[PDB]
Amino acid sequence: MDYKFWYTQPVPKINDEFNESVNEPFISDNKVEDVRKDEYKLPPGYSWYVCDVKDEKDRSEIYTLLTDNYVEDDDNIFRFNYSAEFLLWALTSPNYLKTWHIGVKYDASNKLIGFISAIPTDICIHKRTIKMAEVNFLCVHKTLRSKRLAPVLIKEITRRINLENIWQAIYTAGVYLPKPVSDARYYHRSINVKKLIEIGFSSLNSRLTMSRAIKLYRVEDTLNIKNMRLMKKKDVEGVHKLLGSYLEQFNLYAVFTKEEIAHWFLPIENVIYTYVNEENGKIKDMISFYSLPSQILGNDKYSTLNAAYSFYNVTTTATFKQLMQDAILLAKRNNFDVFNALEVMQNKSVFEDLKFGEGDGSLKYYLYNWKCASFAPAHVGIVLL
Numbered sequence: 001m002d003y004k005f006w007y008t009q010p011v012p013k014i015n016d017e018f019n020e021s022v023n024e025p026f027i028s029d030n031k032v033e034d035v036r037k038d039e040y041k042l043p044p045g046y047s048w049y050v051c052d053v054k055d056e057k058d059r060s061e062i063y064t065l066l067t068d069n070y071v072e073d074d075d076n077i078f079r080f081n082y083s084a085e086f087l088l089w090a091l092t093s094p095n096y097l098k099t100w101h102i103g104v105k106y107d108a109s110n111k112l113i114g115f116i117s118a119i120p121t122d123i124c125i126h127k128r129t130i131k132m133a134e135v136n137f138l139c140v141h142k143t144l145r146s147k148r149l150a151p152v153l154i155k156e157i158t159r160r161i162n163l164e165n166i167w168q169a170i171y172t173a174g175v176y177l178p179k180p181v182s183d184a185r186y187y188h189r190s191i192n193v194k195k196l197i198e199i200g201f202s203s204l205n206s207r208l209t210m211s212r213a214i215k216l217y218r219v220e221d222t223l224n225i226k227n228m229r230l231m232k233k234k235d236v237e238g239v240h241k242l243l244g245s246y247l248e249q250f251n252l253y254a255v256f257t258k259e260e261i262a263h264w265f266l267p268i269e270n271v272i273y274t275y276v277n278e279e280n281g282k283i284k285d286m287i288s289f290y291s292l293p294s295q296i297l298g299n300d301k302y303s304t305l306n307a308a309y310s311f312y313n314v315t316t317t318a319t320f321k322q323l324m325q326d327a328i329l330l331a332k333r334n335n336f337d338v339f340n341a342l343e344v345m346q347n348k349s350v351f352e353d354l355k356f357g358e359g360d361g362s363l364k365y366y367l368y369n370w371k372c373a374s375f376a377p378a379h380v381g382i383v384l385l
């Protein structure tokens with residue numbers, strides 16, 4: 001469209017296109033001393049609020065905000081419903097800054113009507129590793145849309161990130177903004193076929209009857225990798241080597257420390273599931289997926305769609321297809337109705353044989369203040385929450 005806000009930012013214009021040989025900031029030589037020390041101005045009657053995600057009640061307010069006002073599907077049927085424990089995990093990774101968890105209250109009601117967050121992560125883009133912020137959970141109450149609050153939230157979190165001498169960010173969105181480094185479609189694998197049908201997530205046809213669909217998606221309750229088990233603390237060193245080594249082949253990925261691997265992969269029920277295969281004290285395969293339910297809007301039978309989202313999967317003792325089949329089984333065993341994945345890393349290679357269906361959106365990946373060539377999503381090696 002016009003991108004009146006985005007055009008003022010150090011991000012590519014719609015028709016910018018860079019060679020593989022360009023891989024650098026739009027704006028370099030930035031100085032912490034020059035960063036604005038004043039908070040951005042909000043409309044009258046609204047105030048900044050620093051959220052303490054560790055405090056159950058502040059976390060609860062964020063939770064209510066996103067539950068009522070966060071991302072809905074292309075047809076307004078489902079609304080994503082990140083749990084409060086999920087937020088706690090997502091926002092308190094190693095070395096996180098409380099002051100990057102930013103709310104906006106309406107002064108008269110004392111209610112949170114806006115939120116944006118970031119966490120620090122080292123990102124390797126085209127072989128250069130840069131300290132970045134990973135921005136997520138941008139949300140404006142539905143009653144306050146199209147009033148230019150989001151640019152205020154964006155400019156304010158940028159200011160706070162810059163105060164820590166960080167000048168790049170990574171973020172994703174389902175909407176097209178200037179200008180994606182990569183673009184990955186959603187694919188879905190039906191587990192609880194009948195419920196997906198009944199809530200309008202999937203459909204049948206005259207050559208696919210209900211029973212024939214249920215048979216189509218039926219899975220054998222037996223693992224290809226028989227020793228796949230929930231990750232424990234003892235496996236942190238092993239997962240660090242297995243996943244770290246794997247990721248280096250990609251054009252975009254997080255560079256995890258051991259403390260980050262423990263955070264991101266140690267299991268938390270109804271948040272993060274990590275399974276590992278250990279063989280001679282070495283971790284040789286891993287599977288992981290996170291829990292992101294959607295509230296089902298106005299349905300008398302079901303309130304919640306239980307979805308698993310593929311996170312990081314690595315095999316050295318089986319095929320990729322066999323490892324993903326085990327992923328679908330582990331998600332079934334943990335009561336999920338559907339397993340979702342993006343066409344990143346090696347994932348697209350197994351979607352046809354494992355009976356994934358193409359979804360409606362795509363997820364665009366973005367860098368702030370970074371000029372580089374775009375690339376196919378098989379070359380993406382990071383999955384944001």
Ligand SMILES: CCCCCCCCCCCCCC(=O)CSCCNC(=O)CCNC(=O)[C@H](O)C(C)(C)COP(=O)(O)OP(=O)(O)OC[C@H]1O[C@@H](n2cnc3c(N)ncnc32)[C@H](O)[C@@H]1OP(=O)(O)O
Nearest residue numbers: 003005006071136137138139140145146147148149150167
């Ligand atoms: C060095 C550090 C740098 C740190 C920061 C890096 C950048 C981080 C950027 C953030 C990444 C977050 C990633 C993320 O959390 C995950 S992607 C999901 C974002 N959240 C949702 O979609 C939830 C439901 N929607 C809303 O709450 C509102 O519709 C939001 C708040 C989305 C926009 O509220 P609104 O009431 O509809 O809109 P106005 O206030 O009037 O604002 C219009 C301006 O906002 C631009 N816009 C719209 N959606 C966007 C989006 N998803 N990213 C970036 N920009 C987006 C839009 O293009 C326009 O600018 P333009 O006029 O130039 O087009």
Ligand SMILES: [Cl-]
Nearest residue numbers: 008040041155
């Ligand atoms: Cl400004």
Ligand SMILES: [Mg+2]
Nearest residue numbers: 146147148149
């Ligand atoms: Mg607004």
